[PDB]
Ligand binder design. Structure first.
Ligand SMILES: Nc1nc2c(ncn2[C@H]2C[C@H](O)[C@@H](COP(=O)(O)NP(=O)(O)OP(=O)(O)O)O2)c(=O)[nH]1
Ligand SMILES: [Mg+2]
Ligand SMILES: [Mn+2]
Ligand SMILES: [Mn+2]
Length: 539
DNA sequence: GACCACGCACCC
DNA sequence: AAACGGGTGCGTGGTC
């Protein structure tokens, strides 16, 4: 390309180099743009940001986030990553997309700008005639990248003093647990080393081994194995408690307070838009989509996520979303009727599991029932089911039969989906998002059936992801107009922040947007709560 | 310091 | 652990 002076004309493709991957923390080392056979390199990248009207190119959102961090409203535009991701969601990295569609991902901004321009041309050509993928690009993914940029740059408030104090309390309990484990073992060892623990449990204490690990075939010490040995030896209970506390302390309590951004005073995640095989987002650096919630200590951690003073959090979560999506995709008349009647399949399974009235189903029971319902739907074996519920094999097998017999068009839809995936090589969501699953014709049954479970899961999970993304795109401008903020997405959940005086109106509006985003054969219902912290906002 | 593979625990 | 699916992060153990 012909080198030309900064600035570029409108519409040019940008390239940029960051000191580190996280745009809220990165130094902008270099900036360039490409257009019309020319490449323009910025003499000083920070000041040069002011000259761009739009971030157009590879990883556009990340540059937008850094721009917003610097007080500049630079929206992301076209991004070849999003085109490639829609053609094939195994396209997750700029390294791979470049090699696949016509260039090389280097560490030079000018080359990244030229690469962005070339890949856009080629990928746009590949999408010619792919009208449904183009709709997803123009109506979902490209607009969503601007929404995600704002979310990332906004961040969430965290009670750091609370977590610092909690760390000290948990440390004293961990010491109690580890001392007791070492006493029971008859000697100390590194309780964090599962290789050392394996020897203690199965060689020294002679406990029965229950299962093997996947890659190396060691005797497993995982929670599922420990729970089966709960009554074999008192050390097991102490190990399980140690495992929970150290996981929670090492992954959430201790690291998160150290990640508060000095300019914003908030915690900033990344919402990765080309990272999953189904069209879901992921979250990283830190992941704010796996914050604890199930146990009492996990709930204490979730309470650390708080609203700004004068504001409230609003949490919205789709009811039984993938079961509702399944009703629409399969067209099963009975399952459609279940939700037209306002029934709750998780609560109903929980009532049966624990043998108590629906009135008596607490959140832990419903959570356990959720796992059973989706486990069974997506191919859980009768053997594992019998083991999960502590019930005879014949009973577990009968539960599965009753599950599917109730909704006969589901199995028909599954077999239709698999046959189509075999013939086409890909399955697709309601909106046409594709996942390629070539192993559907593998000659090794274990490999083939694993591919099958991946394949017929994707239209369900992926359609739910499409709906959530579309809802975010529609909701974001409404929140801006109301002075409210979108903070987090957790797959079928949004966490908003609203001024106290408008929180009720925001909750009502967001619920209506989410419920009416794209009507299905079944109503979409959204549970909504308001509170000063994330846990209290989920009722 | 970095990378990785792995087992394991976090959530939807 | 197992014929549920989709993810990320930590510590260990090994390596460079
Ligand atoms: N295959 C699979 N999918 C899962 C699992 N857990 C969650 N998902 C998928 C399927 C879920 O539909 C979706 C959202 O998870 P929730 O919001 O925690 N549960 P839901 O929306 O069903 O019920 P409600 O909100 O009324 O309590 O994520 C699981 O164990 N397995
Ligand atoms: Mg204390
Ligand atoms: Mn839900
Ligand atoms: Mn949810």
């Amino acid at each position: 390309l012909e080198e030309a002076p900064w600035p570029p004309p409108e519409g040019a493709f940008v390239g940029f180099v960051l000191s580190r991957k996280e745009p809220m923390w990165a130094d902008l080392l270099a900036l360039a743009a490409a257009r019309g056979g020319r490449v323009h390199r910025a003499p000083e990248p920070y000041k040069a940001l002011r000259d761009l009207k739009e971030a157009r190119g590879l990883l556009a959102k990340d540059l937008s986030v850094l721009a917003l961090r610097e007080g500049l409203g630079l929206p992301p535009g076209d991004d070849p990553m999003l085109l490639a991701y829609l053609l094939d969601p195994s396209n997750t990295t700029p390294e791979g997309v470049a090699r696949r569609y016509g260039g090389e991902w280097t560490e030079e901004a000018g080359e990244r700008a030229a690469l962005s321009e070339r890949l856009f041309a080629n990928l746009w050509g590949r999408l010619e005639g792919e009208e449904r993928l183009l709709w997803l690009y123009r109506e979902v993914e490209r607009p969503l990248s601007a929404v995600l940029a704002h979310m990332e740059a906004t961040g969430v408030r965290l009670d750091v003093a609370y977590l610092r104090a909690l760390s000290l309390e948990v440390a004293e309990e961990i010491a109690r647990l580890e001392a007791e484990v070492f006493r029971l073992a008859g000697h100390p060892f590194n309780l964090n080393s599962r290789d050392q623990l394996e020897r203690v449990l199965f060689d020294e204490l002679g406990l029965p081994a229950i299962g093997k690990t996947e890659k190396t075939g060691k005797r497993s010490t995982s929670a599922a194995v420990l729970e089966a040995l709960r009554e074999a030896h008192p050390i097991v209970e102490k190990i399980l408690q140690y495992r929970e506390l150290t996981k929670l302390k090492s992954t959430y309590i201790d690291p998160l307070p150290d990640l508060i951004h000095p300019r914003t005073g908030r915690l900033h995640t990344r919402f990765n838009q080309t990272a999953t095989a189904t069209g879901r987002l992921s979250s990283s650096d830190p992941n704010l989509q796996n914050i604890p919630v199930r146990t009492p200590l996990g709930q204490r951690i979730r309470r650390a996520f708080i609203a700004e003073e004068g504001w409230l959090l609003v949490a919205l979560d789709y009811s039984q979303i993938e079961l509702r999506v399944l009703a629409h995709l399969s067209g099963d008349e009975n399952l459609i009727r279940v939700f037209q009647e306002g029934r709750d399949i998780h609560t109903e399974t929980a009532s049966w599991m624990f043998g108590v009235p629906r009135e008596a189903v607490d959140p832990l029971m419903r959570r356990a029932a959720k796992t059973i319902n989706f486990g069974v739907l997506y191919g859980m074996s009768a053997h594992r089911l019998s083991q999960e519920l502590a019930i005879p094999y014949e009973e577990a097998q009968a539960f599965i039969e009753r599950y599917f017999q109730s909704f006969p068009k589901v199995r028909a839809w599954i077999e239709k989906t698999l046959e189509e995936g075999r013939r086409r090589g890909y399955v697709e969501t309601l909106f046409g998002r594709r996942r390629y699953v070539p192993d559907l014709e593998a000659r090794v049954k274990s490999v083939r059936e694993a591919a099958e479970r991946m394949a017929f899961n994707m239209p369900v999970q992926g359609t739910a992801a499409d709906l959530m993304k579309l809802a975010m795109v529609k909701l974001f401008p409404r929140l801006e107009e109301m002075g409210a903020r979108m903070l987090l997405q957790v797959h079928d959940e949004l966490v908003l922040e609203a001024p106290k005086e408008r929180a009720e109106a925001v909750a009502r509006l967001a619920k209506e947007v989410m419920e009416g985003v794209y009507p299905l054969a079944v109503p979409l219902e959204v549970e909504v709560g308001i509170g000063e912290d994330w846990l209290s906002a989920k009722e």
